[PDB]
Design a protein around this nucleic acid. Structure first.
Length: 220
RNA sequence: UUUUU
Protein backbone atom coordinates (compact mmCIF):
# COMPACT_ATOMS: atom_id res chain seq x y z
CA UNK A 1 0.00 0.00 0.00
CA UNK A 2 2.06 2.94 -1.28
CA UNK A 3 1.55 6.48 -0.03
CA UNK A 4 0.11 8.81 -2.66
CA UNK A 5 1.69 12.23 -3.20
CA UNK A 6 -0.69 15.17 -3.64
CA UNK A 7 -0.08 18.16 -5.91
CA UNK A 8 -2.80 20.74 -6.54
CA UNK A 9 -2.95 23.55 -9.10
CA UNK A 10 -5.42 25.24 -11.48
CA UNK A 11 -8.59 25.46 -9.36
CA UNK A 12 -10.10 28.84 -10.25
CA UNK A 13 -7.51 30.36 -12.65
CA UNK A 14 -7.98 33.56 -14.70
CA UNK A 15 -9.11 31.84 -17.93
CA UNK A 16 -9.21 34.96 -20.09
CA UNK A 17 -10.15 33.05 -23.27
CA UNK A 18 -11.06 29.58 -22.03
CA UNK A 19 -7.47 28.52 -21.27
CA UNK A 20 -5.12 29.39 -18.43
CA UNK A 21 -2.53 32.15 -18.77
CA UNK A 22 -0.44 31.37 -15.66
CA UNK A 23 2.58 29.15 -16.35
CA UNK A 24 2.40 26.93 -13.27
CA UNK A 25 5.66 25.19 -14.17
CA UNK A 26 7.53 28.51 -14.01
CA UNK A 27 5.57 29.70 -10.95
CA UNK A 28 6.75 26.69 -8.92
CA UNK A 29 10.43 27.57 -9.44
CA UNK A 30 9.92 31.36 -9.33
CA UNK A 31 10.80 32.04 -5.68
CA UNK A 32 12.90 35.23 -5.64
CA UNK A 33 14.07 37.12 -2.59
CA UNK A 34 11.50 39.43 -1.02
CA UNK A 35 13.80 42.48 -1.24
CA UNK A 36 14.48 41.90 -4.96
CA UNK A 37 10.87 42.67 -5.95
CA UNK A 38 10.13 45.44 -3.43
CA UNK A 39 9.49 49.03 -4.48
CA UNK A 40 10.77 50.43 -1.16
CA UNK A 41 14.37 50.28 -2.44
CA UNK A 42 16.07 51.34 -5.65
CA UNK A 43 16.42 48.81 -8.45
CA UNK A 44 19.73 47.28 -9.49
CA UNK A 45 19.98 49.63 -12.47
CA UNK A 46 19.28 52.65 -10.26
CA UNK A 47 21.72 51.48 -7.59
CA UNK A 48 24.42 50.79 -10.19
CA UNK A 49 23.95 54.27 -11.68
CA UNK A 50 24.31 55.82 -8.22
CA UNK A 51 27.56 53.90 -7.66
CA UNK A 52 29.22 55.33 -10.78
CA UNK A 53 28.00 58.84 -9.99
CA UNK A 54 29.83 58.87 -6.66
CA UNK A 55 32.97 57.51 -8.33
CA UNK A 56 33.00 60.28 -10.94
CA UNK A 57 32.50 63.03 -8.36
CA UNK A 58 34.88 61.91 -5.61
CA UNK A 59 37.41 60.63 -8.15
CA UNK A 60 38.23 57.42 -6.26
CA UNK A 61 38.46 53.95 -7.80
CA UNK A 62 36.72 50.70 -6.86
CA UNK A 63 38.96 49.97 -3.87
CA UNK A 64 38.50 53.54 -2.65
CA UNK A 65 34.71 53.17 -2.75
CA UNK A 66 34.88 50.09 -0.52
CA UNK A 67 36.47 52.13 2.26
CA UNK A 68 34.18 55.11 1.64
CA UNK A 69 30.99 53.02 1.61
CA UNK A 70 31.83 51.65 5.06
CA UNK A 71 32.31 55.19 6.38
CA UNK A 72 29.21 56.50 4.62
CA UNK A 73 27.06 53.66 5.97
CA UNK A 74 28.18 54.34 9.55
CA UNK A 75 27.49 58.05 9.07
CA UNK A 76 24.03 57.24 7.71
CA UNK A 77 23.33 55.03 10.74
CA UNK A 78 23.94 57.88 13.19
CA UNK A 79 22.50 60.64 10.98
CA UNK A 80 19.30 59.94 9.08
CA UNK A 81 19.20 59.64 5.31
CA UNK A 82 16.87 62.60 4.86
CA UNK A 83 16.77 64.33 1.45
CA UNK A 84 17.34 67.63 3.30
CA UNK A 85 20.83 66.75 4.57
CA UNK A 86 23.54 69.20 3.53
CA UNK A 87 27.17 70.04 4.19
CA UNK A 88 29.73 67.26 4.57
CA UNK A 89 29.78 63.75 6.02
CA UNK A 90 32.73 62.66 8.14
CA UNK A 91 34.64 59.40 8.56
CA UNK A 92 37.60 58.57 10.80
CA UNK A 93 40.87 57.73 9.04
CA UNK A 94 42.55 56.06 11.99
CA UNK A 95 42.80 59.15 14.18
CA UNK A 96 42.16 62.16 11.91
CA UNK A 97 38.79 63.33 10.59
CA UNK A 98 38.17 63.69 6.85
CA UNK A 99 35.09 65.24 5.24
CA UNK A 100 33.36 64.55 1.93
CA UNK A 101 30.66 66.64 0.22
CA UNK A 102 27.05 65.49 0.53
CA UNK A 103 25.61 67.33 -2.48
CA UNK A 104 27.30 65.16 -5.17
CA UNK A 105 26.25 62.10 -3.15
CA UNK A 106 22.55 63.06 -3.35
CA UNK A 107 22.46 64.12 -7.02
CA UNK A 108 22.98 60.67 -8.56
CA UNK A 109 20.20 58.93 -6.58
CA UNK A 110 17.37 58.64 -9.11
CA UNK A 111 14.85 57.69 -6.38
CA UNK A 112 14.97 59.13 -2.86
CA UNK A 113 18.29 58.71 -1.07
CA UNK A 114 16.64 56.48 1.55
CA UNK A 115 15.97 53.87 -1.13
CA UNK A 116 19.66 53.89 -2.10
CA UNK A 117 20.75 53.32 1.50
CA UNK A 118 18.15 50.55 1.87
CA UNK A 119 20.57 48.29 -0.02
CA UNK A 120 22.90 48.66 3.00
CA UNK A 121 20.22 47.72 5.55
CA UNK A 122 21.42 44.12 5.94
CA UNK A 123 25.06 45.22 6.30
CA UNK A 124 24.14 48.05 8.69
CA UNK A 125 22.18 45.67 10.93
CA UNK A 126 25.21 43.39 11.28
CA UNK A 127 27.40 46.42 12.07
CA UNK A 128 25.34 47.32 15.14
CA UNK A 129 25.66 43.82 16.61
CA UNK A 130 29.42 43.91 16.04
CA UNK A 131 29.55 47.12 18.09
CA UNK A 132 27.10 45.79 20.71
CA UNK A 133 29.21 42.95 22.07
CA UNK A 134 31.61 44.65 24.50
CA UNK A 135 30.17 48.20 24.60
CA UNK A 136 26.69 49.71 24.61
CA UNK A 137 26.28 51.15 21.11
CA UNK A 138 23.12 53.06 20.19
CA UNK A 139 22.80 55.00 16.91
CA UNK A 140 22.02 58.69 17.27
CA UNK A 141 18.72 58.08 15.45
CA UNK A 142 17.71 55.70 18.23
CA UNK A 143 18.87 58.20 20.84
CA UNK A 144 16.59 60.88 19.37
CA UNK A 145 13.66 58.43 19.45
CA UNK A 146 14.16 57.84 23.21
CA UNK A 147 14.33 54.07 22.66
CA UNK A 148 15.10 52.65 26.11
CA UNK A 149 15.67 49.05 24.94
CA UNK A 150 19.37 48.49 24.24
CA UNK A 151 18.66 44.98 22.92
CA UNK A 152 16.69 46.58 20.07
CA UNK A 153 19.72 48.52 18.83
CA UNK A 154 19.91 46.48 15.61
CA UNK A 155 16.90 48.50 14.39
CA UNK A 156 17.73 52.15 15.03
CA UNK A 157 18.21 53.70 11.58
CA UNK A 158 15.72 55.18 9.14
CA UNK A 159 16.79 53.07 6.13
CA UNK A 160 15.97 49.70 7.70
CA UNK A 161 14.08 47.19 5.55
CA UNK A 162 11.39 45.00 7.11
CA UNK A 163 11.82 41.26 6.61
CA UNK A 164 9.47 38.30 6.83
CA UNK A 165 11.49 36.45 9.50
CA UNK A 166 14.21 38.79 10.81
CA UNK A 167 12.02 40.95 13.11
CA UNK A 168 9.59 39.51 15.65
CA UNK A 169 9.01 42.29 18.20
CA UNK A 170 11.16 44.86 16.37
CA UNK A 171 8.38 45.43 13.82
CA UNK A 172 6.29 47.17 16.48
CA UNK A 173 9.27 49.21 17.70
CA UNK A 174 10.43 50.19 14.20
CA UNK A 175 6.99 51.42 13.14
CA UNK A 176 6.50 53.38 16.38
CA UNK A 177 9.72 55.32 15.79
CA UNK A 178 8.67 55.91 12.17
CA UNK A 179 5.32 57.30 13.32
CA UNK A 180 7.00 59.49 15.95
CA UNK A 181 9.51 60.89 13.45
CA UNK A 182 6.75 61.58 10.89
CA UNK A 183 4.24 63.23 13.23
CA UNK A 184 4.58 66.68 11.62
CA UNK A 185 5.63 65.83 8.06
CA UNK A 186 4.09 68.30 5.61
CA UNK A 187 3.10 67.00 2.16
CA UNK A 188 2.74 69.83 -0.37
CA UNK A 189 3.26 69.04 -4.04
CA UNK A 190 3.57 72.65 -5.25
CA UNK A 191 4.73 75.94 -3.74
CA UNK A 192 6.36 79.21 -4.83
CA UNK A 193 6.09 78.82 -8.58
CA UNK A 194 8.58 80.53 -10.88
CA UNK A 195 6.14 83.15 -12.18
CA UNK A 196 6.47 86.59 -10.59
CA UNK A 197 3.09 87.90 -11.87
CA UNK A 198 3.45 91.72 -12.40
CA UNK A 199 2.35 93.01 -15.83
CA UNK A 200 3.65 94.60 -19.04
CA UNK A 201 3.05 98.15 -20.28
CA UNK A 202 3.00 98.72 -24.06
CA UNK A 203 2.36 102.41 -24.73
CA UNK A 204 4.35 104.97 -26.70
CA UNK A 205 5.90 107.96 -24.94
CA UNK A 206 6.05 111.36 -26.64
CA UNK A 207 7.00 114.88 -25.58
CA UNK A 208 3.57 116.14 -26.70
CA UNK A 209 1.74 113.92 -24.17
CA UNK A 210 1.48 113.93 -20.39
CA UNK A 211 3.04 111.41 -17.99
CA UNK A 212 0.43 108.82 -19.02
CA UNK A 213 -1.69 110.20 -21.88
CA UNK A 214 -3.29 113.34 -23.26
CA UNK A 215 -6.38 114.93 -21.72
CA UNK A 216 -9.55 114.97 -23.82
CA UNK A 217 -13.23 115.80 -23.25
CA UNK A 218 -12.25 118.08 -20.35
CA UNK A 219 -13.62 121.62 -20.14
CA UNK A 220 -13.05 124.45 -17.68
C1' U B 1 4.83 55.55 -2.59
C1' U B 2 7.06 59.37 -0.51
C1' U B 3 7.89 61.84 3.89
C1' U B 4 12.55 59.56 9.54
C1' U B 5 18.63 64.23 9.31
Amino acid sequence: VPRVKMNANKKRQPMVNGRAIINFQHLSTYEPEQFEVANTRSTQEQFQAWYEGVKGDYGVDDTGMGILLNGLMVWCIENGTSPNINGVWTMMDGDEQVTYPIKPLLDHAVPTFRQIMTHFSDVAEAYIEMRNRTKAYMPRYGLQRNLTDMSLARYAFDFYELHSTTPARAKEAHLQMKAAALKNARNRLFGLDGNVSTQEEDTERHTTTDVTRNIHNLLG
